[PDB]
Amino acid sequence: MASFKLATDLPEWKKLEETYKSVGEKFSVRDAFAKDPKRFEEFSWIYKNYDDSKILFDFSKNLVNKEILDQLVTLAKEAGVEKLRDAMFAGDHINTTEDRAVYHVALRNRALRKMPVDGKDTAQEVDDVLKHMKEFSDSIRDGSWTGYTGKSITDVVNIGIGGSDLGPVMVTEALKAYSKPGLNVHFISNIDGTHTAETLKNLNPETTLFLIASKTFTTAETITNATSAKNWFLATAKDSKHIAKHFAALSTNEKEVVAFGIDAKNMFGFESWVGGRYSVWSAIGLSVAIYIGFENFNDFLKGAEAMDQHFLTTPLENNIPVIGGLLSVWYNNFFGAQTHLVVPFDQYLHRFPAYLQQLSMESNGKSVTRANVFTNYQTGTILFGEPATNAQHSFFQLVHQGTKLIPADFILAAQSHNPIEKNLHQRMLASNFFAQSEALMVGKDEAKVKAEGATGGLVPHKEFSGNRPTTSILAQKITPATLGSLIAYYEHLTFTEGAIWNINSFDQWGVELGKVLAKVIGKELDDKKAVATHDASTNGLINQFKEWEE
Amino acid sequence: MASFKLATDLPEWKKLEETYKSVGEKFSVRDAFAKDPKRFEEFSWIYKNYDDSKILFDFSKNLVNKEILDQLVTLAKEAGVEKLRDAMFAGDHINTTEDRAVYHVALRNRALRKMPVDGKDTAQEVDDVLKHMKEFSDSIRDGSWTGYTGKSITDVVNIGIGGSDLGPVMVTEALKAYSKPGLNVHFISNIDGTHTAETLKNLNPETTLFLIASKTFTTAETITNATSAKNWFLATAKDSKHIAKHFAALSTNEKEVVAFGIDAKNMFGFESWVGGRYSVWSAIGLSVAIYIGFENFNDFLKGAEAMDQHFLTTPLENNIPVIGGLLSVWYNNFFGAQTHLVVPFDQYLHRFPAYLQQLSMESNGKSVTRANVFTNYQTGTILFGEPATNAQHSFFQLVHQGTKLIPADFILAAQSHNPIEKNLHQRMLASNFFAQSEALMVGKDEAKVKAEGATGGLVPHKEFSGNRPTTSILAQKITPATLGSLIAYYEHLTFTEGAIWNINSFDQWGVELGKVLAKVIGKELDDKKAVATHDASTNGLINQFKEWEE
Ligand SMILES: O=C(O)[C@@H](O)[C@H](O)[C@H](O)COP(=O)(O)O
Ligand SMILES: O=C(O)[C@@H](O)[C@H](O)[C@H](O)COP(=O)(O)O
Ligand SMILES: Oc1cccc2nccnc12
Ligand SMILES: Oc1cccc2nccnc12
């Protein structure tokens, strides 16, 4: 049960409202640096990973100072962020609406700490699945696992959707430098038949392995796609006895896996307390272990584990994911900014914003608190992004000169996996990282526009307000361990937001509804008869579709 | 000059604020359908393309009725949307801050109407470039254009960024069903050296053609990338005389093209009045013509041309892109919704939201009007999206149950290019399209949650408010012509927004700034000496980078 009903019941909330009016709304970052020669030192933190690599989190270009941050920390104390966090790590059923533990942190428990659910340690059970993943992925990679004609596997196709898709997509893209020629990964997720047809068109059934990724193993899109892949395989392989060399399952539901025709020996299990958007650390990450090797996957887990330990053991005022979450609340609930931009200065990380968009919005897009009352304030932000430098040429126009405050996170690795031309491209990339956050802060006033040659009516069009906030995250290199720590940072930032708003960050009743909505209309699409069973728009759309379909 | 200073000066603006308070804020779409048996007919429009194919635009699930729409149309009349539109089509220099015409509509003038800039018809100049594009792309596709060892071209690499990249990416993806096996397109855009290394890793210099896409032909990323591609080519080909068979340019700057070493015969030109985010219709679309054939590219242009004629000749109250733009203003400026979601129920269109994000946000992310005064109201929205059905499993949670109004456009084709399993996947895809917009409108109230079995505190967590607006766009098929009309719809929706806000939708002084910001810091990264020439954050980030770089 909750210790308070609404975030607005916390006494510091109205104090933050007063501080916003007096100090926050018109905050000058330029003035803040001028007033405080140690501002960069005070509002940046170096995170040290388990492997002694480092990530610099620089929050000093945000609309924040000592007073504001101190009050946000007080708000986090009043909200019981630490109590709820400790309950999560203790295995308590803090997913109240589904009565489930929330234990993705147990998936990366490589230290084998005691981490119990329902009073029973999970460490060995998690480790045993990882050992199965290591054995299987090693056998795919070294060629000892062969297809039905005796050939080594060359292509691995993950079939799944949502949390069973986007992690595998984003992480294999992000860590692609660690892959090897001749062993490729592909993804089928959309029910749109295009996804099946285009992905399989050049693949060989003899050398293709399918992973059917589904927590429930009942999702309509995934089972339908999996059946289509089975039909494609059997069109060449003919006999269903060959399925055991080409189909594995990543799931919690052994009975449904076996009923689908997959061998239980080829099932990689996980538990109900793994949320889909928190699941790439589990068996769902098997495509990652195959693509880059289990040891790299394990280093990825250990990076998450190190960030978990930072989040668990650090006082709030120096707790990096807490600080990021507090700033999000500040912008969302006091400035009224509805969005959060994440920009990787890194092409491999091109799907990182989409992954965070699921993690963040599906967790915190809620309107009811843990006291089971409706909110009277804003909850989850709309998260979006694209990689830089491309984004600088497109929607950065609005970030710089529009009418909306868009808090932004910029991410750069100091070292490239592809340092071509003795790092000529990498130095250019880096210079854009520094210069863009600098310009968003400093702006360009009327006098400077005039000095640069504009006169008359042109002048205001070329001005920049400045005081547009950024967070800069500088890693040494995007290794598996670094990426593990970066995802976990956003996981625990998301945790902090939800704890302050007092929402359940771990259910998703809108996604659960979506998975049962379509069946009724699907049955109506089995013929060409006009329908009148819905509202007039739904009827009109269905009936126009029936006139235009094949 | 401008006929008014600020949108809030238009008399209908304050009338719309009164209407918002009295009927808009608490608008019930359910009640609207119950009140009006003809609502679907009244708020849906069938667009007929030049080839007699059709697209249904259904706006009837929006928070709009006859009263509201009539007032928005009155606002558009007061704002002179029609006058500014007619000036655009007349070739007038409505891009006031750069003193340029805005004439992407002239690029798709396949009818060869008189369309003059500076009093000189552009029709034949545009047509001549298209003839060159047809001749060249035909020769690549039929194999008569051979590489320096006499082999036909198998791979075409577009090198460009922003407007010189995202159109080619999005459109070749969207129309991929029209490509041919053995002729593939690739894209290098990011300055990040990863993009060059990964794209070229498996390509053969003897069978690869490069298109250097750059309006100015001076952009830092593009020229640096083009030089790297030239170095890659010459590492195998050795002799620079061989560049003339492997490098072409898409540009307005012949002098810079020739100085780079590309022959003028291999230049495909366009004019200053083509904005990058409106440029895929020009020479910049050459990769599209090569990938799917010039005739398909021409049908794509003719679909845009037909939507141009709809926009130009239709009274405002039935003008489809105007209606979409008026609804955007209604949500942005009266409800205060900061975002606009676009969801293609179509895997080929997976990059369509990213393309629209550039088109929309770079056009309308402005704070100064055509009267050269600062706005006191919201301008450009934040546009985002991912394909369905994937999005239904992720951030649709927030769309359904969060605290933010997110106006959404759903797009579906009635016929698939990949109708596998006798359209089994396609019927499922379609049922999700209908059911999601239905559910966002109808919601699920307390009584229904209780009837479905929830009790006590669980009940509010499973409720859905409904009255969450959607626009449904149902095409017959995503053909080249249909895609042309769809992009042009969003171009002219974007036009309508900017005309009401009285901003210049056609400059981009923030992305122009970005292209000059990085050079100063780039010079500082030539050594490892600590820097103190910036604010303390920029200094600290640079100095930490110097310590951590290779
Ligand atoms: O976040 C979620 O819960 C969803 O995106 C699920 O991951 C998606 O619906 C797939 O569910 P399952 O893994 O049970 O097939
Ligand atoms: O929208 C824009 O103007 C930018 O995205 C440009 O397209 C980008 O900067 C590339 O410019 P250019 O085509 O001159 O190389
Ligand atoms: O039924 C199918 C299953 C898999 C792939 C396919 N590709 C083209 C056509 N049908 C297909
Ligand atoms: O300098 C280069 C140019 C192009 C491709 C490259 N790939 C790897 C390493 N260097 C490269």
Side-chain angles (χ1 to χ4, degrees), chain B residues 6-13 15-17 19-22:
Chain B
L6 300 175
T8 52
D9 294 325
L10 305 171
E12 199 72 6
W13 193 270
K15 294 192 48 180
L16 282 158
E17 178 48 35
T19 300
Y20 174 75
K21 288 188 181 73
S22 65

PDB file of all heavy atoms in Angstrom, chain B residues 6-22, unseen atoms left out:
ATOM      1  N   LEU B   6       0.305  39.114 -35.749  1.00  0.00           N
ATOM      2  CA  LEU B   6       0.262  37.909 -34.928  1.00  0.00           C
ATOM      3  C   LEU B   6      -1.051  37.169 -35.153  1.00  0.00           C
ATOM      4  O   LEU B   6      -2.084  37.783 -35.428  1.00  0.00           O
ATOM      5  CB  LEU B   6       0.414  38.256 -33.430  1.00  0.00           C
ATOM      6  CG  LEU B   6       1.701  38.972 -33.013  1.00  0.00           C
ATOM      7  CD1 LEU B   6       1.633  39.352 -31.534  1.00  0.00           C
ATOM      8  CD2 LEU B   6       2.928  38.104 -33.278  1.00  0.00           C
ATOM      9  N   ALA B   7      -1.008  35.835 -35.038  1.00  0.00           N
ATOM     10  CA  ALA B   7      -2.242  35.059 -35.152  1.00  0.00           C
ATOM     11  C   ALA B   7      -3.300  35.518 -34.147  1.00  0.00           C
ATOM     12  O   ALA B   7      -4.495  35.504 -34.454  1.00  0.00           O
ATOM     13  CB  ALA B   7      -1.947  33.568 -34.960  1.00  0.00           C
ATOM     14  N   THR B   8      -2.880  35.940 -32.950  1.00  0.00           N
ATOM     15  CA  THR B   8      -3.834  36.406 -31.947  1.00  0.00           C
ATOM     16  C   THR B   8      -4.507  37.719 -32.334  1.00  0.00           C
ATOM     17  O   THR B   8      -5.504  38.095 -31.700  1.00  0.00           O
ATOM     18  CB  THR B   8      -3.124  36.552 -30.599  1.00  0.00           C
ATOM     19  OG1 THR B   8      -1.955  37.363 -30.762  1.00  0.00           O
ATOM     20  CG2 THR B   8      -2.699  35.199 -30.085  1.00  0.00           C
ATOM     21  N   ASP B   9      -3.990  38.419 -33.352  1.00  0.00           N
ATOM     22  CA  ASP B   9      -4.642  39.600 -33.914  1.00  0.00           C
ATOM     23  C   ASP B   9      -5.832  39.264 -34.797  1.00  0.00           C
ATOM     24  O   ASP B   9      -6.640  40.151 -35.095  1.00  0.00           O
ATOM     25  CB  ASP B   9      -3.658  40.422 -34.751  1.00  0.00           C
ATOM     26  CG  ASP B   9      -2.567  41.026 -33.921  1.00  0.00           C
ATOM     27  OD1 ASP B   9      -2.859  41.406 -32.765  1.00  0.00           O
ATOM     28  OD2 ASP B   9      -1.426  41.117 -34.416  1.00  0.00           O
ATOM     29  N   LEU B  10      -5.936  38.043 -35.267  1.00  0.00           N
ATOM     30  CA  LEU B  10      -7.067  37.701 -36.111  1.00  0.00           C
ATOM     31  C   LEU B  10      -8.312  37.625 -35.237  1.00  0.00           C
ATOM     32  O   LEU B  10      -8.281  36.982 -34.182  1.00  0.00           O
ATOM     33  CB  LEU B  10      -6.816  36.382 -36.829  1.00  0.00           C
ATOM     34  CG  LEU B  10      -5.513  36.337 -37.641  1.00  0.00           C
ATOM     35  CD1 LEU B  10      -5.242  34.925 -38.128  1.00  0.00           C
ATOM     36  CD2 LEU B  10      -5.566  37.313 -38.821  1.00  0.00           C
ATOM     37  N   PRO B  11      -9.404  38.301 -35.609  1.00  0.00           N
ATOM     38  CA  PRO B  11     -10.579  38.339 -34.724  1.00  0.00           C
ATOM     39  C   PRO B  11     -11.121  36.967 -34.378  1.00  0.00           C
ATOM     40  O   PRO B  11     -11.628  36.765 -33.266  1.00  0.00           O
ATOM     41  CB  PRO B  11     -11.593  39.162 -35.533  1.00  0.00           C
ATOM     42  CG  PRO B  11     -10.752  40.030 -36.402  1.00  0.00           C
ATOM     43  CD  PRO B  11      -9.550  39.198 -36.769  1.00  0.00           C
ATOM     44  N   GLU B  12     -11.022  36.001 -35.292  1.00  0.00           N
ATOM     45  CA  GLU B  12     -11.579  34.693 -34.995  1.00  0.00           C
ATOM     46  C   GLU B  12     -10.777  33.954 -33.931  1.00  0.00           C
ATOM     47  O   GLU B  12     -11.299  33.012 -33.332  1.00  0.00           O
ATOM     48  CB  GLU B  12     -11.671  33.861 -36.272  1.00  0.00           C
ATOM     49  CG  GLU B  12     -12.633  32.680 -36.169  1.00  0.00           C
ATOM     50  CD  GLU B  12     -14.103  33.089 -36.147  1.00  0.00           C
ATOM     51  OE1 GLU B  12     -14.416  34.285 -36.325  1.00  0.00           O
ATOM     52  OE2 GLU B  12     -14.959  32.199 -35.956  1.00  0.00           O
ATOM     53  N   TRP B  13      -9.530  34.364 -33.679  1.00  0.00           N
ATOM     54  CA  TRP B  13      -8.709  33.683 -32.681  1.00  0.00           C
ATOM     55  C   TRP B  13      -9.368  33.727 -31.305  1.00  0.00           C
ATOM     56  O   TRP B  13      -9.491  32.701 -30.631  1.00  0.00           O
ATOM     57  CB  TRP B  13      -7.314  34.316 -32.640  1.00  0.00           C
ATOM     58  CG  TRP B  13      -6.270  33.522 -31.881  1.00  0.00           C
ATOM     59  CD1 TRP B  13      -5.976  33.615 -30.551  1.00  0.00           C
ATOM     60  CD2 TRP B  13      -5.370  32.540 -32.421  1.00  0.00           C
ATOM     61  NE1 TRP B  13      -4.955  32.748 -30.227  1.00  0.00           N
ATOM     62  CE2 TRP B  13      -4.566  32.079 -31.358  1.00  0.00           C
ATOM     63  CE3 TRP B  13      -5.170  32.006 -33.696  1.00  0.00           C
ATOM     64  CZ2 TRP B  13      -3.585  31.103 -31.530  1.00  0.00           C
ATOM     65  CZ3 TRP B  13      -4.194  31.032 -33.866  1.00  0.00           C
ATOM     66  CH2 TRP B  13      -3.410  30.596 -32.787  1.00  0.00           C
ATOM     67  N   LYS B  14      -9.823  34.906 -30.877  1.00  0.00           N
ATOM     68  CA  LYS B  14     -10.442  34.966 -29.556  1.00  0.00           C
ATOM     69  C   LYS B  14     -11.819  34.310 -29.550  1.00  0.00           C
ATOM     70  O   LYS B  14     -12.247  33.790 -28.514  1.00  0.00           O
ATOM     71  CB  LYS B  14     -10.511  36.410 -29.057  1.00  0.00           C
ATOM     72  CG  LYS B  14     -11.724  37.195 -29.470  1.00  0.00           C
ATOM     73  CD  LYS B  14     -11.981  38.330 -28.486  1.00  0.00           C
ATOM     74  N   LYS B  15     -12.513  34.289 -30.692  1.00  0.00           N
ATOM     75  CA  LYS B  15     -13.755  33.525 -30.777  1.00  0.00           C
ATOM     76  C   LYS B  15     -13.495  32.038 -30.587  1.00  0.00           C
ATOM     77  O   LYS B  15     -14.242  31.351 -29.879  1.00  0.00           O
ATOM     78  CB  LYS B  15     -14.445  33.767 -32.115  1.00  0.00           C
ATOM     79  CG  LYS B  15     -14.953  35.186 -32.321  1.00  0.00           C
ATOM     80  CD  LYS B  15     -15.876  35.244 -33.526  1.00  0.00           C
ATOM     81  CE  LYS B  15     -16.913  34.128 -33.461  1.00  0.00           C
ATOM     82  NZ  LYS B  15     -17.843  34.141 -34.624  1.00  0.00           N
ATOM     83  N   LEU B  16     -12.430  31.522 -31.204  1.00  0.00           N
ATOM     84  CA  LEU B  16     -12.076  30.123 -30.999  1.00  0.00           C
ATOM     85  C   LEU B  16     -11.707  29.839 -29.547  1.00  0.00           C
ATOM     86  O   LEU B  16     -11.966  28.737 -29.050  1.00  0.00           O
ATOM     87  CB  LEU B  16     -10.936  29.730 -31.943  1.00  0.00           C
ATOM     88  CG  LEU B  16     -11.419  29.475 -33.370  1.00  0.00           C
ATOM     89  CD1 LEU B  16     -10.262  29.627 -34.364  1.00  0.00           C
ATOM     90  CD2 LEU B  16     -12.040  28.094 -33.474  1.00  0.00           C
ATOM     91  N   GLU B  17     -11.108  30.799 -28.843  1.00  0.00           N
ATOM     92  CA  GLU B  17     -10.835  30.557 -27.431  1.00  0.00           C
ATOM     93  C   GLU B  17     -12.129  30.454 -26.635  1.00  0.00           C
ATOM     94  O   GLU B  17     -12.226  29.632 -25.719  1.00  0.00           O
ATOM     95  CB  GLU B  17      -9.921  31.640 -26.857  1.00  0.00           C
ATOM     96  CG  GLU B  17      -9.623  31.502 -25.357  1.00  0.00           C
ATOM     97  CD  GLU B  17      -9.206  30.099 -24.913  1.00  0.00           C
ATOM     98  OE1 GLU B  17      -8.525  29.375 -25.672  1.00  0.00           O
ATOM     99  OE2 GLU B  17      -9.559  29.720 -23.778  1.00  0.00           O
ATOM    100  N   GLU B  18     -13.139  31.257 -26.984  1.00  0.00           N
ATOM    101  CA  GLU B  18     -14.429  31.138 -26.312  1.00  0.00           C
ATOM    102  C   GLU B  18     -15.089  29.807 -26.640  1.00  0.00           C
ATOM    103  O   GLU B  18     -15.667  29.159 -25.762  1.00  0.00           O
ATOM    104  CB  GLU B  18     -15.338  32.301 -26.707  1.00  0.00           C
ATOM    105  CG  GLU B  18     -14.787  33.659 -26.319  1.00  0.00           C
ATOM    106  N   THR B  19     -15.010  29.385 -27.902  1.00  0.00           N
ATOM    107  CA  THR B  19     -15.580  28.100 -28.282  1.00  0.00           C
ATOM    108  C   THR B  19     -14.844  26.959 -27.597  1.00  0.00           C
ATOM    109  O   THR B  19     -15.463  25.974 -27.174  1.00  0.00           O
ATOM    110  CB  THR B  19     -15.539  27.940 -29.804  1.00  0.00           C
ATOM    111  OG1 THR B  19     -16.303  28.984 -30.418  1.00  0.00           O
ATOM    112  CG2 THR B  19     -16.106  26.590 -30.232  1.00  0.00           C
ATOM    113  N   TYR B  20     -13.521  27.074 -27.464  1.00  0.00           N
ATOM    114  CA  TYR B  20     -12.777  26.051 -26.738  1.00  0.00           C
ATOM    115  C   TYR B  20     -13.298  25.903 -25.310  1.00  0.00           C
ATOM    116  O   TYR B  20     -13.589  24.789 -24.855  1.00  0.00           O
ATOM    117  CB  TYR B  20     -11.281  26.373 -26.725  1.00  0.00           C
ATOM    118  CG  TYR B  20     -10.522  25.404 -25.852  1.00  0.00           C
ATOM    119  CD1 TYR B  20     -10.265  24.109 -26.284  1.00  0.00           C
ATOM    120  CD2 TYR B  20     -10.098  25.771 -24.578  1.00  0.00           C
ATOM    121  CE1 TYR B  20      -9.593  23.209 -25.478  1.00  0.00           C
ATOM    122  CE2 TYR B  20      -9.423  24.878 -23.765  1.00  0.00           C
ATOM    123  CZ  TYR B  20      -9.170  23.600 -24.222  1.00  0.00           C
ATOM    124  OH  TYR B  20      -8.498  22.712 -23.415  1.00  0.00           O
ATOM    125  N   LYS B  21     -13.442  27.019 -24.594  1.00  0.00           N
ATOM    126  CA  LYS B  21     -13.932  26.941 -23.219  1.00  0.00           C
ATOM    127  C   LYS B  21     -15.333  26.339 -23.151  1.00  0.00           C
ATOM    128  O   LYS B  21     -15.628  25.537 -22.256  1.00  0.00           O
ATOM    129  CB  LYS B  21     -13.923  28.326 -22.575  1.00  0.00           C
ATOM    130  CG  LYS B  21     -12.540  28.850 -22.245  1.00  0.00           C
ATOM    131  CD  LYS B  21     -12.649  30.137 -21.443  1.00  0.00           C
ATOM    132  CE  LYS B  21     -11.288  30.720 -21.100  1.00  0.00           C
ATOM    133  NZ  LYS B  21     -10.625  31.329 -22.281  1.00  0.00           N
ATOM    134  N   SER B  22     -16.205  26.695 -24.088  1.00  0.00           N
ATOM    135  CA  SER B  22     -17.606  26.321 -23.933  1.00  0.00           C
ATOM    136  C   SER B  22     -17.937  24.927 -24.461  1.00  0.00           C
ATOM    137  O   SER B  22     -18.804  24.259 -23.883  1.00  0.00           O
ATOM    138  CB  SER B  22     -18.512  27.364 -24.603  1.00  0.00           C
ATOM    139  OG  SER B  22     -18.339  27.400 -26.008  1.00  0.00           O
TER     140      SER B  22
END
